[PDB]
Design an enzyme around this catalytic site. Sequence first.
Site, PDB file in Angstrom:
ATOM      1  N   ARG A  71      -0.234   8.926   1.366  1.00 10.55           N
ATOM      2  CA  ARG A  71      -0.908   8.850   2.686  1.00 10.55           C
ATOM      3  C   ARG A  71      -0.121   7.991   3.685  1.00 10.55           C
ATOM      4  NH1 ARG A  71      -4.300   6.243  -0.948  1.00 10.55           N
ATOM      5  NH2 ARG A  71      -3.807   4.012  -1.028  1.00 10.55           N
ATOM      6  N   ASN A  72       0.692   7.033   3.172  1.00 12.84           N
ATOM      7  CA  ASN A  72       1.506   6.113   3.983  1.00 12.84           C
ATOM      8  C   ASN A  72       2.963   6.538   4.092  1.00 12.84           C
ATOM      9  OD1 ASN A  72      -0.479   4.330   4.929  1.00 12.84           O
ATOM     10  ND2 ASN A  72      -0.568   3.391   2.905  1.00 12.84           N
ATOM     11  N   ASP A  76       0.819  -1.215   0.000  1.00 14.41           N
ATOM     12  CA  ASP A  76       0.000   0.000   0.000  1.00 14.41           C
ATOM     13  C   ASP A  76       0.862   1.278   0.000  1.00 14.41           C
ATOM     14  OD1 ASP A  76      -2.352   1.590  -0.165  1.00 14.41           O
ATOM     15  OD2 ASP A  76      -2.743   1.463   1.996  1.00 14.41           O
ATOM     16  N   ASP A  86       2.894   2.402   7.697  1.00 13.17           N
ATOM     17  CA  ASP A  86       1.846   1.536   7.162  1.00 13.17           C
ATOM     18  C   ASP A  86       0.533   1.620   7.943  1.00 13.17           C
ATOM     19  OD1 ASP A  86       0.677  -0.216   5.188  1.00 13.17           O
ATOM     20  OD2 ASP A  86       0.785  -1.781   6.737  1.00 13.17           O
TER      21      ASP A  86
HETATM   22  C1  LIG Z   1       1.706   4.434  15.758  1.00 16.68           C
HETATM   23  C2  LIG Z   1       2.271   3.759  14.558  1.00 16.68           C
HETATM   24  C3  LIG Z   1       2.448   2.384  14.535  1.00 16.68           C
HETATM   25  C4  LIG Z   1       2.993   1.748  13.437  1.00 16.68           C
HETATM   26  C5  LIG Z   1       3.372   2.472  12.327  1.00 16.68           C
HETATM   27  C6  LIG Z   1       3.992   1.884  11.098  1.00 16.68           C
HETATM   28  O1  LIG Z   1       4.365   2.616  10.203  1.00 16.68           O
HETATM   29  N1  LIG Z   1       4.093   0.502  11.059  1.00 16.68           N
HETATM   30  C7  LIG Z   1       4.508  -0.303   9.994  1.00 16.68           C
HETATM   31  C8  LIG Z   1       3.961  -1.551   9.814  1.00 16.68           C
HETATM   32  C9  LIG Z   1       4.369  -2.343   8.757  1.00 16.68           C
HETATM   33  C10 LIG Z   1       5.315  -1.897   7.846  1.00 16.68           C
HETATM   34  C11 LIG Z   1       5.722  -2.782   6.678  1.00 16.68           C
HETATM   35  N2  LIG Z   1       4.674  -3.729   6.196  1.00 16.68           N
HETATM   36  C12 LIG Z   1       3.641  -3.049   5.366  1.00 16.68           C
HETATM   37  C13 LIG Z   1       2.542  -4.023   5.006  1.00 16.68           C
HETATM   38  N3  LIG Z   1       3.101  -5.199   4.270  1.00 16.68           N
HETATM   39  C14 LIG Z   1       2.050  -6.136   3.824  1.00 16.68           C
HETATM   40  C15 LIG Z   1       4.162  -5.856   5.069  1.00 16.68           C
HETATM   41  C16 LIG Z   1       5.238  -4.861   5.442  1.00 16.68           C
HETATM   42  C17 LIG Z   1       5.875  -0.638   8.041  1.00 16.68           C
HETATM   43  C18 LIG Z   1       6.898  -0.053   7.110  1.00 16.68           C
HETATM   44  F1  LIG Z   1       7.252   1.222   7.403  1.00 16.68           F
HETATM   45  F2  LIG Z   1       8.084  -0.731   7.095  1.00 16.68           F
HETATM   46  F3  LIG Z   1       6.420   0.016   5.839  1.00 16.68           F
HETATM   47  C19 LIG Z   1       5.469   0.138   9.114  1.00 16.68           C
HETATM   48  C20 LIG Z   1       3.189   3.852  12.338  1.00 16.68           C
HETATM   49  C21 LIG Z   1       2.629   4.480  13.427  1.00 16.68           C
HETATM   50  C22 LIG Z   1       2.529   5.903  13.423  1.00 16.68           C
HETATM   51  C23 LIG Z   1       2.619   7.099  13.446  1.00 16.68           C
HETATM   52  C24 LIG Z   1       2.843   8.497  13.404  1.00 16.68           C
HETATM   53  C25 LIG Z   1       4.004   9.184  13.632  1.00 16.68           C
HETATM   54  N4  LIG Z   1       3.801  10.524  13.446  1.00 16.68           N
HETATM   55  C26 LIG Z   1       2.535  10.656  13.070  1.00 16.68           C
HETATM   56  C27 LIG Z   1       1.768  11.776  12.724  1.00 16.68           C
HETATM   57  C28 LIG Z   1       0.499  11.578  12.360  1.00 16.68           C
HETATM   58  C29 LIG Z   1      -0.042  10.258  12.345  1.00 16.68           C
HETATM   59  N5  LIG Z   1       0.602   9.178  12.664  1.00 16.68           N
HETATM   60  N6  LIG Z   1       1.906   9.423  13.034  1.00 16.68           N
END
Ligand SMILES: Cc1ccc(C(=O)Nc2ccc(CN3CCN(C)CC3)c(C(F)(F)F)c2)cc1C#Cc1cnc2cccnn12
Length: 292
Positions: free
Chosen positions: A160-161, A156, A174
């Site tokens: 937005r991500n 995705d 994500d």
């Molecule tokens: C609380 C929180 C928890 C988790 C995550 C997060 O990004 N998790 C994540 C999960 C999986 C994956 C990779 N997979 C994708 C799917 N895929 C099928 C498998 C691989 C990645 C990735 F970055 F590596 F992509 C990240 C972000 C936040 C946030 C926040 C935050 C910080 N500042 C702000 C300001 C405004 C709003 N929110 N915010």
Amino acid sequence: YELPEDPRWELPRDRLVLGKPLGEGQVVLAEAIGLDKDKPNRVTKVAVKMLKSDATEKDLSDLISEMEMMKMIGKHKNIINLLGACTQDGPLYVIVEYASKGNLREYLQARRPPGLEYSPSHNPEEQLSSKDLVSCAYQVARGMEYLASKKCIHRDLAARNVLVTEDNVMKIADFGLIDYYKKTTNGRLPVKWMAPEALFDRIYTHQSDVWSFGVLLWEIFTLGGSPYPGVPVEELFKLLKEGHRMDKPSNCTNELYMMMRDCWHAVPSQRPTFKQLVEDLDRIVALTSNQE
Ligand SMILES: Cc1ccc(C(=O)Nc2ccc(CN3CCN(C)CC3)c(C(F)(F)F)c2)cc1C#Cc1cnc2cccnn12
């Protein structure tokens, strides 16, 4: 409820001061005291993910799995990094880096040129040069190249991500994590970022994320533009089957449009890789004017 303790990541609950909600499990802004071993006296603004009160055992397993994945992937400047967790004696909190300037779509739109009589009060105190825009593209490609090296497929990738920090660093997010007619909070259809083979054959690879990255490049150069506005799911399927491609945005070089189009190759094996995109974007950044 009763999770095992990972001392690598455990932060005591009394060290976390929960603040205003950022989004909705649910994400809240917080202040972490002594997140690092030294200093135990410094506060760091962080984002905390937790379950809502109506969550099930599946939602808990999803949050655990997401936290577990972030541990495995490791640290990179252009990804939202895991900073800690509260897993013991209370609800699970997944602590990650805070991006004060929100998602890239919001960041771009707020920096659009000022409103005119044909728009007329959008008066930004913030503006982006052509070099800044290519820099955003480079940083996102860098985060993706890192995720790809860790065998991670996003699925995705979209503006937005991508989150933006106080220092304007792009961080892939994500929301480590299907209904084609389900719209985003902003009212957009995520199918508009999906490679045809992911959409029609459910084949997800780094090549399909490269397709999504091409749509993300288009979002950057239209300053948060909405792909295919007014196009419903069924008509989008028809546009893809016809080999339709989005037009070149204005204030986009032929070279960058050629990059978008290459990302949108019908044949997945023929698309550039994130490694090639990082190298091309590195060269393009250096040659792009910051004078306008
Ligand atoms: C609380 C929180 C928890 C988790 C995550 C997060 O990004 N998790 C994540 C999960 C999986 C994956 C990779 N997979 C994708 C799917 N895929 C099928 C498998 C691989 C990645 C990735 F970055 F590596 F992509 C990240 C972000 C936040 C946030 C926040 C935050 C910080 N500042 C702000 C300001 C405004 C709003 N929110 N915010």
